[PDB]
Amino acid sequence: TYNIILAKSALELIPEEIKNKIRKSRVYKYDILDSNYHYKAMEKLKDKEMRGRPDIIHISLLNILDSPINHEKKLNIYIHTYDDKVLKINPETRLPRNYFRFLGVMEKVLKGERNHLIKMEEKTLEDLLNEINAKKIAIMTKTGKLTHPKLLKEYDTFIIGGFPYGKLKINKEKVFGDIKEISIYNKGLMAWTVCGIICYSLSF
Amino acid sequence: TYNIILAKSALELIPEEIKNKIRKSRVYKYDILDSNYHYKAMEKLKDKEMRGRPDIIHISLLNILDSPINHEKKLNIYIHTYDDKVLKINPETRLPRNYFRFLGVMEKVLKGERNHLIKMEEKTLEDLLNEINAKKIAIMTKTGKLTHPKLLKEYDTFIIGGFPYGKLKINKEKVFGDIKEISIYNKGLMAWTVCGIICYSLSF
C-alpha cells in the first residue's frame, strides 16, 4: 500500500488575523479561505501566495480518488494543510464534483464535525510521516532529480505540495524515513497533474 | 502529433426546447445547461442523462492542458459537443480554475463571440475526424478491447465521451479512418481520468 500526501495544502478556515476583513456573502458563503474571493483581505497575510486555493486540492483529489490504483484499494490518502491539520481520505469517498459542494463538505470537517469518510486531526507533516511509518519518501519538486515515473514504485510514500507557489519546506531531521527529492518532468506542473502521473505510474 | 477529442460533450447553451421551464436565479447566471441547477427543467429533455455536465469538460481540460505531452506541443485538443459544435482549444489556453469563470468563457464561445485561443465551428464528430485526417482512432469505453496504456502510442486519435451516462456511437461508414473500441481498465472511469491516463501514456 502506498501513501500519497498533498502537503502544506492551501485548504484552511479563514485565518484569525484576517477574519475581520472577510464577511460571508451570498456569492461565497463558506468559511474556507479562497483567494478568488478574498484576495484583497489576504494582502498582509503570511505566505499569502501559497494559501487560499482549495481548488487545487479539489482537482487533485478528483484525480486520486478515481485512479485505478485507488479503485484497487492500494492507496492511503492524506491532505496535510498549511496550518497543520491532516485529513485522511477514505478510498471510497465520493467527492462532490461541484466546487461549492466540495467546500461545504471540507468546511464541516475542518470545523471538527464528524465525517465517517474524512477524518481530521491536528498534525504536522513530519509527525504524519512518522505515524504512518513512511520509510522511502519521494518529495515531488521540479528542482528534484529527474526520474522516469517507472521508478516511483520503489517508494512507499509520495509528497506533493497542495499549493500554487513556493517550495515545500520539511524538517528532514525530524523524519525517521529517508527523503529523496524527485522531478518527473523538466517544467513546473500543477499538483493535480503530478498526483495523476504518480497514480498512473503505480498501475502501468 | 496526437488528437484528443472529448466527444458528444455535455456542454451546451440552454436548449430552446426547455427555456420556458427555466427559472432564472442570481445563484446561477449562465446560459449553459447544468443539471445541478436545471434538473427539473430537464425532466423531459431528450438524452437528459448525458447532458448538462460542463464540469466533466472543465476537469478533463485542466488535466489535458497541463499534461507534459501538451507542454511539448504534441496534442491537438478538441471538444465536440452533444449538439455538434467543435471547439479547437489552443495548447496555450489558460483555462480558469474557477468553474464559474470557465462557464463564462465557454458561454461566449458557444454564442459565437470571437476567442483567439478557442475556435468554434458547427460540425459533426465524423466530419471533424475526416477533416483532421484521423487515421487510427481509439474510442475509449469500458466495453472495448482491454489494452495496456503503452499500446496507445500506436493510435493518432483518441475519443473520450465528454458525458456522464451513455455510450458513444459513431457512424462507421461516415469516417475515413479506422475506429477501434479500447478499454484501458475493467472498471468504468471518469472522463478526466481516462484523459489523464492517455496523456501520460503518451509522455512516458
Ramachandran angles phi, psi of A163, nearest 5°: -145, 165
Give the closest-approach CA distance of A127 to chain B in angstroms. 32
Tell which residue, A139, A165, A142, has the closest CA to residue A52: A165
Alpha-carbon span A161 to A149, nearest angstrom: 18
The HSE-up count of residue B47 (CA atoms within 13 Å, CB side) is 18
Q: Other CB atoms closer than 10 Å to residue A130's CB: what's the count?
A: 14
Q: What is the Cβ-side half-sphere exposure of residue A125, based on CA atoms within 13 angstroms?
A: 26
Residue showing cell 502544506 = A8
- Cβ atoms of A196 and B63 closer than 8 Å: yes
* Cα(B132)–Cα(A74) distance, integer angstroms: 40
The residue of chain A with its CA nearest to that of B164 is A97
Name every residue whose Cβ is closer than 8 Å to that of residue B91 and which is 6 or more positions away in sequence: B65, B70, B73, B75, B77
**Which residue of A193, A197, A199 to mutate against B (max B Cβ within 10 Å)?**
A193
Cite the DSSP H helix spans in chain B: 35-38, 54-66, 68-71, 99-110, 125-131, 191-203
Whether the Cβ atoms of residue B204 and residue A149 lie closer than 8 Å to each other: yes
Binary contact (B62, A192; C-beta < 8 A): yes
Rounded to whole angstroms, the Cα distance separating B79 from B75 reads 13
The answer to whether A35 faces chain B, any CB pair under 8 Å, is no
Q: List the grid coordinates of B15.
A: 436548449
**A104 CB within 8 Å of a chain B CB:** no
Tell me the residue type at A195: C
How far apart, in whole angstroms, are the C-alpha atoms of residue A137 and residue A181? Answer: 8
Experimental method: X-ray
Which residues are CB-contacts of A19 (< 8 A; sequence separation ≥ 6)? none
Annotated binding site of A for S-adenosyl-L-methionine: 140-142, 161, 166, 184-189
Phi, psi angle pair for A113, to nearest 5°: -70, 140
CA distance B71 to A189: 10
CA neighbor of B45 nearest in space, from B86, B25, B16, B67:
B16
Contact A63 B196 (CB under 8 A): yes
CA A167 to each of CA A8, A55, A143, B119, B173: distance values in angstroms, whole numbers, following the listed order: 10, 18, 10, 37, 54
CA distance A98 to A96: 5
Placement of cell 438524452 in the chain: B47
Architecture of domain A1-204: 3-Layer(aba) Sandwich (3.40)
| Resolution in Å, one decimal place | 2.2
Enumerate the H helices of chain A as residue ranges. Answer: 35-38, 54-66, 68-71, 99-110, 125-131, 191-201
What type of residue is A180?
K
**A189–B148: do the CB atoms touch at under 8 Å?**
no
The CB-side HSE value for A56 (13 A sphere, CA atoms) comes to 28
Nearest by CB to A97, from B55, B97, B148: name it: B55
A151 vs B: CB within 8 A: no
- Quick check: A82 and A12 in contact, CB under 8 A? yes
Please give the residue of chain A at the shortest CA–CA distance from B198: A200
Residues of B in contact with A187 (CB under 8 A): 68, 71
Residue extents of the structural domains in chain A? 1-204
Residue A196 sits at the chain B interface (C-beta within 8 Å): yes
Which DSSP category does A32 fall into? B
Residue with cell string 476567442: B115
The conformation of residue B145, written as its DSSP 8-state character, comes to: E
Give me the residue from A56, A148, A196 closest to B63, CB to CB. Answer: A196
Mutate to test the interface with B, among A184, A185, A204 (most CBs of B within 10 A): A204
Residue bearing cell 483532421 = B132
Residue A26, classified by CB atoms within 10 Å of its CB into exposed (0-12), middle (13-18) or buried (19+), is exposed
B25 at interface of A, judged by CB pairs closer than 8 A: no
